[PDB]
Write a protein that binds this ligand. Structure first.
Ligand SMILES: Nc1nc2[nH]cnc2c(=O)[nH]1
Ligand SMILES: Nc1nc2[nH]cnc2c(=O)[nH]1
Lengths: 338, 338
DNA sequence: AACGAAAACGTTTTCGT
DNA sequence: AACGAAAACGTTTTCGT
């Protein structure tokens, strides 16, 4: 079809391609004519041909976990902004923590020859770690580990643990000594990592959390609903609660309400994530905020670098969580005694 | 590189490609050898080359509005399932109702040669309608108009109006005669269309809604926060409210709560969308449910068809909303008198 | 000064025999 | 029976002059 263009214009495809990409000077006269044709013929230059030659697709792949999930969704929207910004195309792939699913997208991707790979897989068993390596040749950055699991990738770290700690501290300095926790999946960073951050502060304060007070969630609202329940559904309950994620929080919220419990007047809740609309949670949610735009833009950036300035060595940038005080927490019994 | 494979195996690339795609019979002996090489050499067949020949990318493009937005997010996750299912690659593009933005993604897409285009642009001015047409050559389906705006596309219709009506009716049959409404952007279907569905039921019932009782939203929580406010912030307020979208509802919820109003005991609220986690809204939200998985799978389907069974004529499938009773509504003053 | 001719990128596929 | 040789898909780019 560029051949067809060259012809309508009576110039060489070379000339055509020169004008279409301003890659060498062309007489105006000639230049307009190309356009002229470029426009009657209704020409859409083929990137597949181009990429075929120039060897890069100006396209990047997101090998994600899921995308409805608020938290996720937010990061992704971010990353896409950056792609569009710097002229890249985003191929979105959810593998739902499925390994096969994952080996499958990985492959489709390599085959479609993405210029780089952004990874958000949530859990990283040796077998996944392994497949990932088989692709060290395509540049890539995992945006969700807490420390650096591998030497063949760029890593952006969230300081999830320090976030965990922040949370604890708050409750503590608020008068709280009877706290419970609904962590998220321990095989995840934002899972384990936040729990431990929280657990240091406790240990530091000589607060012990009775195992009947810690209930695993999975970041989905229903998980928090049951958690809260099981907690408040007991003889002795805590005065305050640290919930691993806002969405679950939001579930913890509804259940308390359903047992006729008042938050924060009857139970205090502090979440984690600071999702776009936690402020409209009801009681406005006090939570730890996770930089998600920066987590995205930063990730894109390390990838571009590698991609463009052909980097070889792995790199890692930290990011920082930070407390947002909202309306879900109240003074505990010890506030005054400190 | 297939050349390199053929060689390690000492067979022709033709043979190689035959085995890699079981497209003609090959001796086992020969076949294994190809694999053998295919695997030491660590070969990843290039789809760009392939597509270059076979003329199809087995890749589909989503020219969306935004993707954080719960509603949206949900549909997209759907569509991606279908892509993965039937071996397609999803290129996600948000144009944020930006025209330029839109002409830009449209183009990148055509240039990357997507096999079909899934459109979710929300608003459709003549100028967008116009650009869209310039691409009638690439197959496509708009998944968000209410009636069929054009003859050069497949359309999936939501029956948004009948949903509007359903909502009204409910409040009506619940004893309500003093209702307010926070519609969404009127230049959108789920905007206009739902309002009118609601407005027929009113007219039908001889209920009039005092203009000081209808407040435009934009589907984002903050919009509903202010809306609710402005409503309850007045001398005379309605006993019940119809909110155009769940997320805004969720905002309407928080504000009522912030004015010390009890829902549904002080005001009733009925939303619309039945977003994944409206049940964990607090008071569990009674809303109209929009089939979003089916809206997605159905869309993919009409596209595949066109794509595969090379269809020429436009088509349109309707889908149906349906009432979900939750805990946000209460009997109105006239329930008993009917 | 301003532009062309021809090879190459990595496949698939028609005919061969 | 089972496989090869060679053209083609739509570009970009080196050398020309
Ligand atoms: N949905 C969800 N939210 C999160 N917030 C932090 N980690 C996660 C995760 O794995 N899933
Ligand atoms: N966010 C959002 N939710 C919706 N629900 C129905 N239409 C819309 C829309 O345009 N945006």
């Amino acid at each position: 079809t560029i051949k067809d263009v060259a012809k309508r214009a009576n110039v060489s495809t070379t000339t055509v391609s020169h004008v279409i990409n301003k890659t060498r000077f062309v007489a105006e006269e000639t230049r307009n004519a190309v356009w002229a044709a470029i426009k009657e013929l209704h020409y859409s230059p083929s990137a597949v041909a181009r990429s075929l030659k120039v060897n890069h697709t100006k396209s990047i792949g997101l090998l994600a976990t899921s995308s409805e999930a608020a938290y996720f969704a937010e990061i992704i929207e971010a990353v896409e902004k950056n792609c569009f910004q710097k002229g890249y195309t985003l191929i979105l792939g959810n593998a739902w923590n499925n390994l096969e699913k994952q080996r499958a997208y990985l492959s489709m991707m390599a085959q479609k020859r993405v210029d780089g790979l952004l990874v958000m897989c949530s859990e990283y068993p040796e077998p996944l770690l392994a497949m990932l390596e088989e692709y060290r040749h395509i540049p890539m950055v995992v945006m969700d580990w807490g420390e650096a699991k591998a030497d063949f990738t760029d890593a952006v770290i969230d300081n999830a643990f320090e976030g965990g700690y922040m949370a604890g501290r708050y409750l503590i300095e608020r008068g709280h000594r009877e706290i419970g926790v609904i962590p998220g999946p321990l095989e995840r960073n934002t899972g384990a990592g936040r729990l431990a951050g929280f657990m240091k502060a406790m240990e530091e304060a000589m607060i012990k959390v009775p195992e009947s007070w810690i209930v695993q969630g999975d970041f989905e609202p229903e998980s928090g609903y049951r958690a809260m329940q099981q907690i408040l559904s007991q003889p002795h309950r805590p005065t305050a609660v640290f919930c691993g994620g806002d969405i679950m929080a939001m579930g913890a919220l509804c259940a308390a309400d359903e047992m006729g419990l008042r938050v924060p007047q009857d139970v205090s809740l502090i979440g984690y994530d600071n999702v776009r609309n936690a402020r409209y949670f009801t009681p406005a949610l006090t939570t730890i905020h996770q930089p998600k735009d920066s987590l995205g833009e930063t990730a894109f950036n390390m990838l571009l670098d590698r991609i463009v300035n052909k980097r070889e060595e792995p790199q890692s940038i930290e990011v920082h969580p930070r407390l947002i005080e909202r309306r879900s927490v109240a003074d505990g019994p010890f506030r005054d005694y400190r």
